[PDB]
Design an enzyme around this catalytic site. Structure first.
Site, short mmCIF file in Angstrom:
data_model
loop_
_atom_site.label_atom_id
_atom_site.label_comp_id
_atom_site.label_asym_id
_atom_site.label_seq_id
_atom_site.Cartn_x
_atom_site.Cartn_y
_atom_site.Cartn_z
CG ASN A 116 -10.17 3.48 -1.30
OD1 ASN A 116 -10.73 4.56 -1.05
ND2 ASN A 116 -10.12 2.50 -0.44
CG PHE A 120 -17.10 9.87 2.28
CD1 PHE A 120 -16.79 8.53 2.43
CD2 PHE A 120 -17.24 10.67 3.43
CE1 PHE A 120 -16.59 7.98 3.73
CE2 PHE A 120 -17.08 10.14 4.70
CZ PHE A 120 -16.73 8.80 4.85
CB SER A 187 -13.29 7.48 5.40
OG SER A 187 -12.57 7.78 4.22
CG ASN A 189 -9.20 7.96 1.31
OD1 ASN A 189 -7.98 7.97 1.54
ND2 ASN A 189 -9.85 6.88 0.92
CB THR A 190 -13.20 12.45 4.81
OG1 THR A 190 -13.90 11.95 3.67
CG2 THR A 190 -13.88 13.74 5.29
CE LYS A 241 -15.66 -0.40 7.32
NZ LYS A 241 -16.02 -0.48 5.92
CG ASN A 270 -12.76 2.14 6.71
OD1 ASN A 270 -12.30 1.96 5.56
ND2 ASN A 270 -13.82 2.92 6.96
C1 LIG Z 1 -12.76 1.43 -3.40
C2 LIG Z 1 -13.19 1.26 -1.96
C3 LIG Z 1 -14.18 2.11 -1.47
C4 LIG Z 1 -14.60 1.98 -0.14
N1 LIG Z 1 -15.55 2.85 0.35
C5 LIG Z 1 -15.98 2.70 1.68
C6 LIG Z 1 -16.98 3.50 2.18
O1 LIG Z 1 -17.54 4.37 1.49
N2 LIG Z 1 -17.36 3.35 3.48
C7 LIG Z 1 -16.79 2.43 4.29
O2 LIG Z 1 -17.19 2.34 5.48
N3 LIG Z 1 -15.81 1.60 3.80
C8 LIG Z 1 -15.40 1.73 2.49
N4 LIG Z 1 -14.41 0.88 2.00
C9 LIG Z 1 -13.81 -0.14 2.92
C10 LIG Z 1 -14.48 -1.48 2.79
O3 LIG Z 1 -15.81 -1.36 3.17
C11 LIG Z 1 -13.79 -2.53 3.63
O4 LIG Z 1 -13.91 -2.19 5.00
C12 LIG Z 1 -12.28 -2.66 3.34
O5 LIG Z 1 -12.06 -2.69 1.96
C13 LIG Z 1 -11.66 -3.90 3.97
O6 LIG Z 1 -12.26 -5.12 3.56
P1 LIG Z 1 -11.59 -6.04 2.37
O7 LIG Z 1 -10.17 -6.30 2.84
O8 LIG Z 1 -12.46 -7.23 2.26
O9 LIG Z 1 -11.58 -5.25 1.09
C14 LIG Z 1 -14.01 1.02 0.68
C15 LIG Z 1 -13.04 0.17 0.18
C16 LIG Z 1 -12.61 0.30 -1.15
C17 LIG Z 1 -11.54 -0.66 -1.62
O1 LIG Z 2 -14.70 6.90 0.01
C1 LIG Z 2 -13.57 6.55 0.47
O2 LIG Z 2 -12.50 7.05 0.09
C2 LIG Z 2 -13.38 5.52 1.56
C3 LIG Z 2 -14.17 5.50 2.66
C4 LIG Z 2 -13.92 4.57 3.62
O3 LIG Z 2 -14.59 4.53 4.63
N1 LIG Z 2 -12.91 3.72 3.46
C5 LIG Z 2 -12.10 3.78 2.39
O4 LIG Z 2 -11.20 3.02 2.31
N2 LIG Z 2 -12.36 4.69 1.42
#
Ligand SMILES: Cc1cc2nc3c(=O)[nH]c(=O)nc-3n(C[C@H](O)[C@H](O)[C@H](O)COP(=O)(O)O)c2cc1C
Ligand SMILES: O=C(O)c1cc(=O)[nH]c(=O)[nH]1
Ligand SMILES: Cc1c(C2(c3ccc(C(F)(F)F)nc3)CC2)c[nH]c1C(=O)N[C@H](C)c1nc[nH]n1
Ligand SMILES: [Mg+2]
Length: 378
Positions: A116, A120, A187, A189-190, A241, A270
């Protein structure tokens, strides 16, 4: 029948969605079902031998939903009622943001992986705070939800120069409704966000956030309305995080800061930018989630559990799909688990299924309760 997260039609719809329908469209439909309160729900009392805690946070079971799944807090009740004990909403920023250009989310079912580049996308702290207030008022009237926990992940707007100004803005607006605050310095992506994991910058960030929360308490303690409109009725805990793409020297320096600042917990971890064996993600940007992140993030839990000398509780995030995955995180050092990719690939049954698998595993392994397993790998 229809209310049951394991009702047979959900898996059929999900396989069809994963094959033919864009990822963000699937997510928006999930959110719409949640908005109109027509998602299934888990009608089980959870086992007391699988409860867990971080400080005074008493989780009714060890499985929450990771940040980013409900960025705007519009689906809290329905996601929790799938069987999760907590949810981290956000990440939020002071001003709203539509995020990077679409398509920006891609799934690989074979490897159970996601990539992804969202950036944000959220409606902004002010609007999300109204959404959380609505939940907190429904919770005050629904004893079914009185013990569920809601954390808020906070970050910066893309164009903000000093991250701390944005973090303080979010605390002063939404902090009174949060059971914990997660500081997002990870993140991918910022631009520039992950630079804030350097020890000097991280230390100032943590102390500034803690001071803003402490000032919130000081200035409103004799208000007529009680300040903490959350589950704990206490000031929110502070978590950081972390990104898994750090070297051993950075991890050690971070751990030293976490010990000195008395952070309440760390979320490990993350998404990663170091996986490129997924053919279908070639020439796609962003962080990878899911099965290919499991091992990386579990090793990282072990490292930080040891660098912090077991003094900082850990929230595990990364490739957790099964009860065995969850127990590996817990034995590695984690006190609680967060899911994202499991929900995408296993659907409505995610919590019911993993809770059952973990319980049976605690039986098989001879543990009296889950707490006995925390860090037992060490
Ligand atoms: C589409 C998407 C959006 C996410 N947005 C955030 C986010 O806004 N803030 C954050 O701390 N992590 C974000 N994450 C990371 C997840 O919270 C998580 O840490 C990560 O996907 C790893 O766990 P998983 O392997 O169970 O998916 C995002 C992940 C995905 C796939
Ligand atoms: O908004 C996102 O792009 C994002 C935030 C984050 O903390 N982790 C991530 O994988 N995507
Ligand atoms: C597949 C899925 C789902 C589920 C779902 C969705 C729709 C339906 C159905 F009712 F229509 F059949 N059933 C299940 C499993 C529960 C939620 N989200 C997703 C998804 O792909 N999300 C991507 C990674 C995303 N996009 C933005 N942020 N994250
Ligand atoms: Mg706003």
């Amino acid at each position: 029948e229809s209310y049951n997260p394991e009702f047979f039609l959900y898996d059929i719809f999900l396989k069809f969605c994963l094959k033919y329908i864009d990822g963000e469209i699937c997510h928006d439909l999930f959110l719409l079902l949640g908005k109109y309160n027509i998602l299934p729900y888990d009608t089980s009392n959870d086992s007391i031998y699988a409860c867990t805690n971080i400080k005074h946070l008493d989780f009714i079971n060890p499985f929450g939903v990771a940040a980013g799944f409900d960025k705007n807090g519009v689906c809290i009740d329905s996601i929790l009622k799938l069987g999760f004990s907590f949810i981290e909403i956000g990440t939020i920023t002071p001003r709203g943001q539509t995020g990077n250009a679409k398509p920006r989310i891609f799934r690989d079912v074979e490897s159970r992986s996601i990539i992804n580049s969202c950036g944000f996308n959220n409606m902004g702290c002010d609007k999300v705070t109204e959404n959380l207030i609505l939940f907190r008022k429904r919770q005050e009237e629904d004893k079914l939800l009185s013990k569920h926990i809601v954390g808020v992940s906070i970050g910066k707007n893309k164009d903000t120069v000093n991250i701390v100004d944005d973090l303080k803005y979010c605390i002063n607006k939404i902090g009174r409704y949060a059971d914990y605050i997660a500081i997002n310095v990870s993140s991918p992506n910022t631009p520039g966000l992950r630079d804030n994991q350097e020890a000097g910058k991280l230390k100032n960030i943590i102390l500034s956030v803690k001071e803003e929360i402490d000032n919130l308490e000081k200035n409103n303690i004799m208000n007529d309305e009680f300040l903490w409109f959350n589950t704990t009725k206490k000031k929110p805990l502070v978590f950081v995080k972390l990104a898994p793409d750090l070297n051993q020297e950075q991890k050690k320096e971070i751990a030293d800061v976490l010990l000195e600042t008395n952070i309440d917990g760390m979320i490990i971890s993350n998404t990663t930018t170091q996986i490129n064996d997924i053919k279908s993600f070639e020439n796609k940007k962003g962080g990878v989630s899911g099965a290919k992140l499991k091992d990386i993030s579990t090793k990282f839990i072990c490292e930080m559990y040891n660098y912090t000398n077991k003094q900082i509780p850990i929230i595990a995030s990364g490739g957790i799909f099964s009860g065995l995955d969850a127990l590996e995180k817990i034995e590695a050092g984690a006190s609680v688990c967060q899911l994202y990719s499991c929900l995408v690939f296993n659907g409505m049954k995610s919590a019911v299924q993993i809770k059952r698998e973990l319980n049976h595993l605690l039986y098989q392994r001879g543990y009296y309760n889950l707490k006995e397993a925390i860090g037992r790998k060490h």
